Paper text:
AMPA glutamate receptors (AMPARs), the primary mediators of excitatory neurotransmission in the brain, are either GluA2 subunit-containing and thus Ca2+-impermeable, or GluA2-lacking and Ca2+-permeable. AMPA glutamate receptors (AMPARs) mediate rapid signalling throughout the brain, and orchestrate various forms of synaptic plasticity that underlie learning. These cation channels assemble in various combinations from four core subunits, GluA1–4, with each contributing unique gating kinetics, trafficking and subsynaptic localization. AMPARs exhibit a modular architecture with a two-layer extracellular region connected to the transmembrane ion channel (transmembrane domain, TMD). The ion channel is encircled by diverse auxiliary subunits, modulating receptor gating kinetics, pharmacology and ion flux, with the transmembrane AMPAR regulatory proteins (TARPs γ2, γ3, γ4, γ5, γ7, γ8) being the most abundant.
A GluA2 mutant (F231A) increasing NTD dynamics phenocopies this behaviour, and exhibits reduced synaptic responses, reflecting the anchoring function of the AMPAR NTD at the synapse. The Phe231 to alanine mutation, which destabilizes this interface, slowed desensitization recovery of GluA2(F231A), both in the absence and presence of TARPs (γ2 and γ3). To probe the relationship between NTD stability and gating further, we determined a cryo-EM structure of resting-state GluA2(F231A) fused to TARP γ2 (GluA2(F231A)/γ2; edited at the R/G site), a receptor combination permitting comparison with existing GluA2/γ2 structures.
Numbering used by the authors:
A (entry chain F): 5 to 43, 55 to 84, 92 to 162, 173 to 210
B (entry chain E), D (entry chain G): 5 to 42, 55 to 84, 92 to 162, 173 to 210
C (entry chain H): 5 to 43, 55 to 84, 93 to 162, 173 to 210
E (entry chain A): 505 to 551, 571 to 634, 784 to 823
F (entry chain D): 505 to 551, 570 to 635, 782 to 823
G (entry chain B): 506 to 551, 570 to 635, 782 to 823
H (entry chain C): 505 to 549, 571 to 634, 784 to 823
The structure:
Amino acid sequence: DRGVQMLLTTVGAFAAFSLMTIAVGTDYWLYSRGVCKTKEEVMTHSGLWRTCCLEGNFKGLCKQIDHFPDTAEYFLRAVRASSIFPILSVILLFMGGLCIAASEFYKTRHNIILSAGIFFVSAGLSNIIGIIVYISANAGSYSYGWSFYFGALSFIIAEMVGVLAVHMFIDRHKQLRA
Amino acid sequence: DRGVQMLLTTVGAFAAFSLMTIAVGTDYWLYSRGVCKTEEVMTHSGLWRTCCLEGNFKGLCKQIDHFPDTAEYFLRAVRASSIFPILSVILLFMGGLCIAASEFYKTRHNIILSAGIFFVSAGLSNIIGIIVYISANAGSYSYGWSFYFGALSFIIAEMVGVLAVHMFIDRHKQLRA
Amino acid sequence: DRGVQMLLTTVGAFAAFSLMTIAVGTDYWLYSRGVCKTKEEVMTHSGLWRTCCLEGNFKGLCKQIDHFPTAEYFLRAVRASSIFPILSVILLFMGGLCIAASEFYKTRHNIILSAGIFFVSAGLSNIIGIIVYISANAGSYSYGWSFYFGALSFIIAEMVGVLAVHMFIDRHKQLRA
Amino acid sequence: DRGVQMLLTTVGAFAAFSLMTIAVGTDYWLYSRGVCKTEEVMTHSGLWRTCCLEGNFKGLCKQIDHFPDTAEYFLRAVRASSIFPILSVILLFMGGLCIAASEFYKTRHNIILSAGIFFVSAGLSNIIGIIVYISANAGSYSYGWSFYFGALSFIIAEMVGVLAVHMFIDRHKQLRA
Amino acid sequence: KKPQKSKPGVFSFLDPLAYEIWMCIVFAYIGVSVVLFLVSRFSPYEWFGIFNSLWFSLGAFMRQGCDISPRSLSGRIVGGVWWFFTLIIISSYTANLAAFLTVERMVSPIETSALSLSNVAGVFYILVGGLGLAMLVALIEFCYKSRAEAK
Amino acid sequence: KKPQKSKPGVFSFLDPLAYEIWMCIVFAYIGVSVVLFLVSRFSPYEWEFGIFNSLWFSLGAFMRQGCDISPRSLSGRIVGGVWWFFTLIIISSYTANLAAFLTVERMVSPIESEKTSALSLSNVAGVFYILVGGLGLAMLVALIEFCYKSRAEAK
Amino acid sequence: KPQKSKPGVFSFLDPLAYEIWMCIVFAYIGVSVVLFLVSRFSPYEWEFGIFNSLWFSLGAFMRQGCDISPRSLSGRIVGGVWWFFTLIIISSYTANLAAFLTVERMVSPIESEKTSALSLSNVAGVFYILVGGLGLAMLVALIEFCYKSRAEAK
Amino acid sequence: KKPQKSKPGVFSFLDPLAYEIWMCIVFAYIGVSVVLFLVSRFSPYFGIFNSLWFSLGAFMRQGCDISPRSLSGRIVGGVWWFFTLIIISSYTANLAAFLTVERMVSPIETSALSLSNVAGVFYILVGGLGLAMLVALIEFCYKSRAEAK
Ligand SMILES: CCCCCCCC/C=C/CCCCCCCC(=O)OC[C@H](O)CO
Ligand SMILES: CCCCCCCC/C=C/CCCCCCCC(=O)OC[C@H](O)CO
Ligand SMILES: CCCCCCCC/C=C\CCCCCCCC(=O)OC[C@H](O)CO
Ligand SMILES: CCCCCCCC/C=C\CCCCCCCC(=O)OC[C@H](O)CO
Ligand SMILES: CCCCCCCCCCCCCCCC(=O)O
Ligand SMILES: CCCCCCCCCCCCCCCC(=O)O
Ligand SMILES: CCCCCCCCCCCCCCCC(=O)O
Ligand SMILES: CCCCCCCCCCCCCCCC(=O)O
Ligand SMILES: CCCCCCCCCCCCCCCC(=O)O
Ligand SMILES: CCCCCCCCCCCCCCCC(=O)O
């Protein structure tokens, strides 16, 4: 039904945005074995921005990861240094949320729901590129933390919500043809 | 040609059940070369008892010692208790029971579907059992006629399942007329 | 047109039969580096039956191949005998007979089909024979012209088989119109 | 639309012809470290003349000697005489003539078809020329703008052939209707 | 020490590719299916649903089914790049498996060859599990429909 | 004597996979075909996968050959997808292990107490024997069907 | 010491020389064009257009779909040789990649074991191409939709 | 002696399999096509050209327009599919063996595949395109003449 579909789209959009925002701000992406603070190797957090230390003589200390301690490698290093792709995923999810909010008001436009669908799909694609860039940048034991999987779950939910938005727009234009 | 179909399916169900039961109970699954009850001599090992021949005291034989990374423990457990061959036997029994009850309380033509489902599931259980058996054997040799009785039970069970489903389809076809 | 198809089938059948018979008879299957006769090394014909010396101390001496000195034994049996090339010749002969009897004792319309089946089967027999030959030999060299006569026989036999089947189809078509 | 298409095919034909003619003429096919007119120095080699650059006597050009198995000899011949690039140029010229003659004799549509076949054939000749060129070179380096002019000529020739065939189909649809 | 013959993992058929490659293959599959669905069925001026998009993408990855292919430019772009991706990834899987087996075969210590059922048993488990799941789903749908008749 | 290289046996094209893998492949084939047939056509609410067409589908999926028909149901698609995955793994693994065999020859002594060569016809003769045997069998089956249907035409 | 390198993006093209890739593209265009010509040029038989010929060729190479197969003699000749070409080239790609991954040969830039699983770093480029293609597809679809919407107003 | 790098043959792409395997492949292809045609059309109760096409596409692991529907046709198709799978796998495996062994050869003390290695397949391709164009034009001229003058 239309009401249930719209509610489920809105809830999914909010969930995806919240998950991606948490992931891009929290620090538990990679349980590697690095250095807490330098200039003895122990376990670490190593998020997207700050590599907090754990299980060492001093815990909880965080330093900004040393991005830039080969132009092909330089561009990847730059793209990982910022999180243009994770951040862009967050922005696109936010803009999709704005579109869905404008759906209820100022309605009968029928092209803002399409916009929401396009934004959610694009957010998913941005997220996947971000994940690949991140995993590639760390190839130079380990494990992935819950913030990484929050990013992944965000991707899946964003794709589902995009499907819902596109399907919902198709109905409007079917109704608007009957 | 209905009527002969019922006889053929009943015969097949009985044959599959008997073959699988014989296979489980009998112990000629593997002609290895190991130690009899506690020199290496041949043995007709089975699902339960690794049993001796062509030895000093041939014919005296024991229960296989299954046990000496949770995956190894779980596979050893699943192979110790022949849950999958036994489940195959049970499902073949239930399938045969449904086919028998297809005479009583007739006109349902919905339990014979259950018969088909049971036979198919028995075949799937049987294949999983074979795979676990062979996998656990890897923790010269040959396979005995008990192994092939299990395999033949699988084939006949699948054929009988196809017949049962076909009969259910034909029954609903007649009903829809 | 229909009139020429019989000529093409018959002449192709004769060509295939002649080529296969020549190949089975002649000795230029394999230009190997062999022994002219035992108890040093020179180029040799090594046909299907007799290996014959050339470019040697006494050029022209021809001897029988010593095929012999369990799968290998059976292959030796099938190769020493030429059951498959010989069977190809027989089947081509029977196909030719069927084509000939197409006119005399006419209107049977299954004799033409038999001709087609015989020619196709002769092709298949020929290929099996070639594979057996090549497998038996190995374990430089070159292949003579009798070998390629066999190969060309295969190709022509398959073409003639296709023509025969096509002619049978056309009859049973007219018949229904 | 129509009317534009003839102009576009004409322009494309001229562009392809000019590019391929320049490419066959000029000598920046390959940047390699060879020897100038007869140490090492960068040498823009072409189809005909290997010539010296960034040296004491840059701008001195020498005719390439394409010679010191039969395949090697024939490849050396086919590459020495740039028969395939030249044939590409000739076919592009003939295609241009066919397109030009289209405006006259317009009642006959097989001349706009011929134009398409010539352009497509020119593309195929170009491909074979590139393959022989690279292969002969193979029996650090880089490719210069002449090589890529040949490549772009191939692309445009294929596009123009597509357009020529497309307009032949229209012309024959109007007369079908 | 004794050579200590290795026991292969159940899901050892995944070894040729890193875990992150499998993960990203699944994400790419979802993305491709969704985008194919969107570009194919989204413009009034046309009316591959989502389920058919998913099926199409799977059988491209498995180098299998070819039931229906996109006919539009956008659908064809998506299909073509997914076919490229699939070709590279499957070729790479086979090549790295061959590397694994070849290297493991030329090890010579200080002084059977065929592939055993243990090396692939996990794929059989997945197969039979999938057959069971399929039967369950079919029966669930049948029970649903049989209970959905007006009484 | 030094363990010289063995002459390739007829049916050596099966050597990359253990006998048990082949046997279980055949069992899996039968099971998949039967389950696809069951799921595709058992509910009266569905009323092209009969048992024979299910078997054909499964065979051609294994040999990565044609399709001709694809399940359209959820459940039939589950079955097809797992069979496709299985096929991909098993065929890839066959090719990989054969490459391993051909790359490194590994001789072993029968008792204990390099510029690689083109495959010869001896290495695949078995598959040719099977092919021609299958062609003969196909012809035989066709002729039996025709003779039978001809007798049915008599009466 | 040479110290085996970190694999580059677009290293999935390494098994075949740059010239093979270039000539594959040329052969693809040639095949597509000739299939289109030899199928839609006779008025004496007026599906294989220019975009359906290109699609056929693409899918034949990627060992993928088959919407249509040429039914004429000439189209079948073209299809058959393109199929042969594809089989050889793809087999050769897989074989040479296997050779690369089996034996590592580090090269000294100047002169005068355990076979790890394959990491996301040496297939990353194919992922980037995939997502770029998805973005491009979405863009093209939206452009077509905007164009159709504006035209429909009149 | 100097290394003397060996030029790959134009048709070196056929090297993984012996000459006799290629010969027997062609014989097998003709046999399969003919038997498929007979067991499919012979009963009054897949023509030759369509059967040849089916077999060709089966071998190149490629096309799939139509497939046999009868028992006999399906037996023929099944054995041909098995044969194809074994032969193609064996070709790829032996090519990999060739390249791996050639890559581990150390002399006394790029690696990509060059256009020279696959040149013959390009020659065949373009030859086939030329032949196709010629066949098309011959048919078209014949059809133009065929109309009652
Ligand atoms: C619409 C389509 C219908 C559905 C089509 C379904 C077919 C696809 C299934 C593929 C295999 C899936 C299972 C993959 C195996 C997972 C095993 C695994 O993850 O192993 C863990 C390992 O121990 C390390 O963590
Ligand atoms: C429904 C339509 C029917 C289509 C049917 C198509 C057939 C496809 C399979 C053919 C290979 C089967 C033959 C395999 C023979 C194996 C040889 C063997 O048994 O090995 C010998 C021995 O065990 C070791 O020495
Ligand atoms: C008819 C409509 C079909 C639509 C088209 C579908 C897509 C085609 C498939 C694959 C594209 C592959 C693109 C390959 C990109 C190569 C990148 C590259 O070459 O970069 C490496 C660099 O040169 C090293 O230094
Ligand atoms: C019914 C439709 C028919 C479609 C028809 C198109 C199919 C063409 C396929 C492959 C051609 C391969 C040609 C093989 C040529 C190789 C010959 C060769 O070179 O052999 C001599 C060798 O070089 C000495 O060393
Ligand atoms: C086509 C759909 C396929 C989906 C398959 C889902 C399988 C999920 C298994 C996840 C295992 C994750 C292992 C964690 C490893 C780690 O990071 O330590
Ligand atoms: C259908 C796919 C199209 C292919 C797209 C190709 C884009 C990359 C081209 C890179 C060219 C690099 C120039 C090499 C320089 C040289 O050595 O001459
Ligand atoms: C869509 C194609 C099917 C593939 C889906 C497979 C998903 C596998 C998920 C990851 C598990 C394998 C990783 C191994 C972990 C380890 O090294 O211990
Ligand atoms: C998809 C179903 C059929 C596929 C073809 C499978 C071939 C079956 C072979 C079974 C017996 C194999 C015997 C090999 C072991 C040995 O040589 O001792
Ligand atoms: C069916 C034709 C398309 C197939 C896909 C081919 C796409 C690859 C083309 C890339 C161009 C060559 C550049 C890579 C080589 C290099 O720079 O080392
Ligand atoms: C169904 C057709 C399959 C493809 C056929 C490929 C062409 C093979 C023709 C025989 C070529 C012989 C090559 C070996 C040459 C030699 O070493 O003397």
